[PDB]
Design a protein around this ligand. Structure first.
Ligand code: ING
Ligand code: ING
Ligand code: ING
Ligand code: ING
Lengths: 303, 303, 303, 303
């Protein structure tokens, strides 16, 4: 039957002074609650271990580095992995990754897939970085992702997580059809990730009231056109004076939203998932092999 | 000159024996009404000169050929072009194209762009052909496009139509992000086309109640993610005992539906279009040059 | 905290020859699955024990009567109540009620609320009967609810079901704001019911493609304007050659759909429910006592 | 004569010191453009002659009074009426009404219907006043409508405007089914009005991202359940540092949105209206006389 129960663990705000230990307690509670409701996997938000630090311009590099993980998992996060293995529930965790390679301090906006045995099965590094690189005074709050992270270097992989083929996306990635399609072409049955999406956009404020719409539209369209179940976990609420979007969701291969959060705090939602459901699209209206004419899509891949 | 009024001329059913002369009378009426309401361009349906013949299994090539145009325009369709020039309103007309090359017949599901001077300024040939190849006895109506048409050989071009950069899609094409993206990368400000979409799908009837949803979801996502205005003109209603989807629409570059038809007969809808609105997406959240990482999209173009 | 887990048990078709015993097996499976996922209450469809008989014109009264329950519960349905008490999960069951009073054979389209102790806490009889009274040859299938049922005589009550105030609606009732408002004025925190909604409407077929839209619009609007959680359980799929609408759902007091079914078969969905959530609407934007001016609504109650 | 073209003239912000003469220039422009595109009636916003003054806590009655109209029309607004008669296009204008009766001041949030001859044919006074009564220090902006306006005393009338039966609602009124229903029971074919809806709500900010949703949900449900065309004209944009909702719209009696504004400035949208379309709902699924059971709706009218 190839069935499972997918869950999404939305997070309420994470204060700048909130410790990773405190955040892990909140993550543990949601993972535990999810498991008790039958979930075999739970998706957590992007950069789920800290406040969304890209909203500030840092002058002290040591301060910036404090928001990154140099180990995964480290002693502080270890408990989450142990509980995942115990209860047999995998998860997708987003965090800031700092790794020194060949004399370079590399920083990535990262996410990992952990199976029901508590083992890291795959990693993904955010490829589409939104925002800017330099401080901009006209903004009530910054979004320096291009300053704090370099574009991911692992491409868009699809991993075998227990019985499912899963692909990861991180926040802004969900808005790019290329990210979805590459993973769709790689057979992803589930495409999931998290996000920190302020409901106010300094550059184009006239789209503020469409924040929920644009988020859900991207999730629904991606799922439908690739015949993939999808899930998006947001960190929402008023975090350090910046309102973040909620509406975390789980979407069927038809693009139908099957589960949606309604609060702006830590919230768990679940939905029954039949991996064979993807066939309704992938063996018919979106039977890639039978319908696609790649000879005409060259421009999409031009450098 | 960055302002204009776009119109969609949805068609009601076209009977198997309804003549092109009769159909041209209907098209003339809609183009004339669109112009009277300020429109400078009107989008018509896919295969807008005949009934949707791909629903039948033909056994006589002469009968099949009767539904194709050997010239564009011929004496029968010429009046539409003359009226377009007269009133200063261009149009997108879909039709079945039959070409004879050195004794070889080429068949395409085609659409053309005509400017406000009544001159053909661009052509497109359906690349994504839906349906099946052989007669399937269980179906109340067939969908043999793969047998009656060859996949388009013009790619997804974008043409200058008066003061706008316009790209064309034909029916099923609207569900493929690759089609939208290629035209998006080519700077299309308006992406338009028509469609004949039965509200019943024999192989996957469990999606029948989602026909409107999938159609609108595709139009909205495509527009939003490419920062393009879009329009889709359907031929709707009970045509030869098969119910076709209505909900013809005009969409803003934000993915917002600005105009929608509510009947299943010939119906004109219009909407004010500012070509500079595209910038809200294309110079920011979807600033292609600044955010895309094409080195990771290669799989999309692999044959 | 006043929290609970609400569930909806959508039904696939029920054949005319399917026995109540067989249907009870299907109901038991969904109630059991719901309970295992934490649900404390599950909503079942309207007339959930038989095929939707109003689609046929009966000449034999004995045949018609066979579709009605003269006992509730009877030996056949007893198991459902016993399992509800055992697992501590209440339910809303719809069925055809036949009762002889004062020499009259009374027929109602009925629904009951059963608490987690397996006890019937309240009854409701469908007040808004759609359809017609006499056979109509132009219809591919009838909808003789006005012939087979008399309008409910219990008004729109709200009952205490365990820790929640619950109101019942039956199918067509969900489209009437009066039904929702009366129960809203009676403090309902949850408003639930089921439905058999063909996706084809003989009288006004031009609305067929809007069947899902009209259903969800009614559920969403009712919940929002009354600050009530709501749930609708449909019996969907191809039942005796008539396609019935799916999209069973659970909706928050804000009108946000939090759970939705995607198949057309027996399907269980659940959602976490916080009864205090109603306050976000009922103590503010929809604070009835502070905002309503009943002196101007008289016409709504005029006979 | 059952056909017409309805228009909505959405307004951008109106500054505190912006004069009525300047505002009339803006209204004239929209009414003129609507007429040039075929409209015979244009709906304008609630309190369309001034900034939304209820956002402030007034301490000087003379200052408060300055935002009200003592006559309608006065010399300043007269030009709009003359142009309406000239071009043959009626309108719905919202404004603050100040009436002096035997030394007693009466204050109302009012709207009037003017026909294509420039004659006032109907008035309505906002019955559902949102917000609070006293100054609340924590709010970035107040909403003291309950202090500056008395609930309307004209009920929810329906007037003959040229060839259409039209009913009026004002802002918050659109969220109350009782308002729509009374006009529905009175045969309204078009129910219209305007609004000033901040995208931020101080007491319940957790619904901020749902502002568009709740607005459109109310318009769609109201239209559908009363089989009425509807239109809502908002005054949108950043007005005096408070962001107001846009998404002005025209809706079919099916609840389908046929036209929607996408900017936050003065914007005209139009849509073809067939008054007989109402029959699709009112002579069938919502045939009031045949389906309603008012003897059970009594609680709705109880004082
Ligand atoms: N975390 C993250 O990527 N957030 C962005 C929000 C954003 C949009 C546009 C410009 C800047 C920032 C998102 O795409 O959801
Ligand atoms: N004309 C056209 O392309 N019609 C198809 C409908 C379709 C879908 C799937 C299978 C067969 C046919 C469309 O994509 O709108
Ligand atoms: N069971 C039930 O009430 N079904 C009706 C479907 C219907 C609509 C209109 C006319 C006739 C029948 C419903 O309102 O969902
Ligand atoms: N002008 C107007 O009525 N505005 C209100 C917005 C509102 C809601 C709730 C509380 C306060 C204010 C509206 O209902 O659209």
């Amino acid at each position: 039957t190839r069935q499972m129960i997918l869950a999404v663990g939305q997070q309420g705000p994470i204060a700048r002074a909130e410790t990773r230990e405190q955040v892990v307690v909140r993550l543990l509670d949601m993972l535990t609650k999810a498991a008790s409701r039958g979930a075999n996997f739970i998706v957590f938000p992007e950069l789920a271990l800290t406040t969304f630090f890209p909203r500030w311009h840092f002058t002290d590099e040591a301060e910036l580095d404090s928001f990154y993980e140099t180990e995964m998992p480290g002693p502080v996060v270890r408990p989450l992995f142990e509980k995942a293995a115990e209860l047999g529930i995998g998860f997708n965790l987003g965090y800031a990754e700092l790794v020194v390679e060949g004399g370079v301090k590399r920083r990535f906006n990262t996410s990992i897939l952990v199976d029901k045995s508590g083992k890291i099965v795959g990693k993904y590094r955010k490829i589409h970085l939104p925002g800017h690189k330099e401080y901009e005074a006209y903004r009530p709050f910054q979004h320096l992702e291009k300053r704090y992270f370099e574009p991911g270097d692992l491409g868009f992989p699809v991993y075998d997580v227990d019985a499912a083929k899963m692909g990861m996306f991180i926040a802004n990635d969900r808005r790019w059809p290329e990210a979805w399609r590459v993973m769709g072409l790689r057979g992803a049955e589930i495409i999931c990730g998290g996000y920190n999406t302020p409901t106010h956009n300094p550059p184009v404020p006239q789209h503020d009231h469409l924040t929920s719409f644009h988020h859900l539209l991207s999730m629904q369209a991606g799922s439908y056109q690739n015949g993939a179940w999808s899930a998006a976990a947001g960190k929402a609420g008023m975090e350090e004076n910046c309102m973040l979007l909620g509406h975390s969701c789980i979407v069927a291969p038809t693009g139908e939203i099957v589960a949606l959060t309604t609060t702006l705090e830590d919230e768990v939602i679940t939905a029954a998932v039949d991996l064979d459901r993807c066939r309704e699209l992938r063996e018919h209206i979106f039977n890639f092999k039978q319908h696609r004419q790649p000879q005409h899509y060259g421009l999409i891949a031009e450098l």
